[PDB]
Design an enzyme around this catalytic site. Structure first.
Site, PDB file in Angstrom:
ATOM      1  N   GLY A   4       0.781  -1.220   0.000  1.00  0.00           N
ATOM      2  CA  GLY A   4       0.000   0.000   0.000  1.00  0.00           C
ATOM      3  C   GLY A   4       0.817   1.276   0.000  1.00  0.00           C
ATOM      4  N   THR A   5       0.109   2.402  -0.075  1.00  0.00           N
ATOM      5  CA  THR A   5       0.698   3.740  -0.066  1.00  0.00           C
ATOM      6  C   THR A   5       1.496   3.969   1.217  1.00  0.00           C
ATOM      7  OG1 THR A   5      -0.580   5.201  -1.526  1.00  0.00           O
ATOM      8  CG2 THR A   5      -0.083   6.012   0.701  1.00  0.00           C
ATOM      9  N   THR A   6       2.450   4.883   1.167  1.00  0.00           N
ATOM     10  CA  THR A   6       3.235   5.156   2.356  1.00  0.00           C
ATOM     11  C   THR A   6       2.545   6.240   3.200  1.00  0.00           C
ATOM     12  OG1 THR A   6       5.386   6.051   3.112  1.00  0.00           O
ATOM     13  CG2 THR A   6       4.704   6.576   0.859  1.00  0.00           C
ATOM     14  N   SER A  58      -2.140   2.157   5.858  1.00  0.00           N
ATOM     15  CA  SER A  58      -1.654   1.716   4.552  1.00  0.00           C
ATOM     16  C   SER A  58      -2.126   0.286   4.347  1.00  0.00           C
ATOM     17  CB  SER A  58      -0.123   1.740   4.506  1.00  0.00           C
ATOM     18  OG  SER A  58       0.381   3.040   4.734  1.00  0.00           O
TER      19      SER A  58
END
Lengths: 141, 233
Positions: free
Chosen positions: A30-32, A75
């Protein structure tokens, strides 16, 4: 033998729980997102990928508030993240209703923890596909 | 089914050209014992809505928490919480109305008379009533309990019909309100001299005046009243 990674609450021969470890994989993908603890509060920040010019800017807020003093960012699988926050809001609401005082961050943390730990106790459930950064200011900073 | 214990008396209100005004004394009676005195019965929700409550105080305190919870909730995942998607007086009322009726319908009412006063996002004045039975209604002036009998007659002299609202200024209105509060102090045996008053103006916002007091009372003639008929001294 093998196949200790097909059911959730199962212990592998070396004492692990692969289903949970596989969850982590969804998280890492996932995104940071981060959290910084300053000396009189906390700051939350997160990466929002522009999958397309079609996404209305600023319009898909990720960070969420619990009660009026807690912030949450995660995340991994977003829907799982929202699910956990909904639980947090309920938990915070229940706590305040009986003790009057808004839930202390340390107390809120364990509320989320016990809940998430619960999803690693049965094969009838899947672990959460998110890691969550959260915090706030309470009676003790 | 219950029976009130600690209670608040009248809650009076009316609407002027730009907003609405609402007031209520700070007493929490316990039968004929004027037990508690620092009781605020005007609940501001946001700053475009003020909820005045009378009746059982324990139930009032309960309705207060419900309101604060409503504010917290509305903020969840709401980037326009203090803009296009902030609580409107009409929402707060419809909610309270809903709750009130459900409770009487389950034979366990919230023993209260409630008036929601405020200004809608489009500037419109909002003023509606709801009680323990779930009954509701609107009028240029609204008062609960004792105030329905004494305050309304007075307030209606200022805003008797719709076309009177625009002709009424905040000064005139606030005056009527303050005078009604005095009258209620004269004849309601469950009233207090201290009260709160709040104004919700579409231009000046929310003005919440706490710790007012009935002033300019006429008591001097009382010295000329002796006996109850034939007594001379």
């Amino acid at each position: 033998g093998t196949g200790y990674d097909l059911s959730n609450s199962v212990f592998s021969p070396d004492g692990r729980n692969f289903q949970v470890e596989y969850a982590v994989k969804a998280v890492e993908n996932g995104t940071t997102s981060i959290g910084i603890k300053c000396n009189d509060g906390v700051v939350f920040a997160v990466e929002k990928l522009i999958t397309s010019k079609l996404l209305v800017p600023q319009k898909n807020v990720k960070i969420q508030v619990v009660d009026r003093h807690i912030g949450c960012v995660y995340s991994g699988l977003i829907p799982d993240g929202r699910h956990l926050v909904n639980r947090g809001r309920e938990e915070a609401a229940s706590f305040k209703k009986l003790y009057k005082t808004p839930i202390p961050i340390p107390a809120f943390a364990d509320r989320l923890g016990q809940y998430v730990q619960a999803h690693t106790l049965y094969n009838s459930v899947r672990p959460f596909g998110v890691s969550t950064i959260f915090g706030g200011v309470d009676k003790n900073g | 089914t219950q029976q009130p214990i600690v209670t608040g008396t009248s809650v009076i209100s009316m609407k002027y050209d730009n907003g609405v005004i609402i007031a209520a004394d700070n007493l929490g009676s316990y039968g004929s014992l004027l037990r508690f005195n620092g009781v605020e019965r005007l609940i501001p929700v946001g700053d475009n809505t003020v909820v005045g409550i009378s009746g059982d105080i324990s139930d009032m305190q309960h309705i207060e928490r419900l309101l604060k919870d409503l504010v917290t909730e509305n903020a969840y995942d709401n980037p326009l919480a203090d803009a296009e998607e902030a609580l409107e007086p009409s929402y707060i009322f419809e909610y309270l109305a809903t709750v009130m009726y459900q409770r009487r319908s389950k034979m366990n009412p919230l023993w209260n008379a409630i008036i929601v006063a405020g200004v809608q996002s489009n500037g419109d004045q909002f003023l509606r009533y709801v009680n323990l039975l779930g009954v509701t209604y609107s009028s240029p002036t609204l008062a609960t309990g004792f105030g329905a009998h004494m305050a309304n007659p007075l307030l209606r002299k200022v805003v008797d019909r719709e076309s009177d609202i625009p002709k009424t200024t905040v000064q005139v209105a606030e005056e009527a309100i303050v005078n009604a509060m005095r009258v209620l102090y004269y004849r309601d045996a469950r009233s207090s001299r201290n009260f709160s008053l709040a104004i919700i103006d579409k231009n000046t916002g929310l003005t919440f005046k706490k710790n007012l007091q009935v002033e300019n009372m006429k008591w001097d003639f009382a010295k000329d009243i002796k006996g109850y008929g034939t007594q001379k001294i």
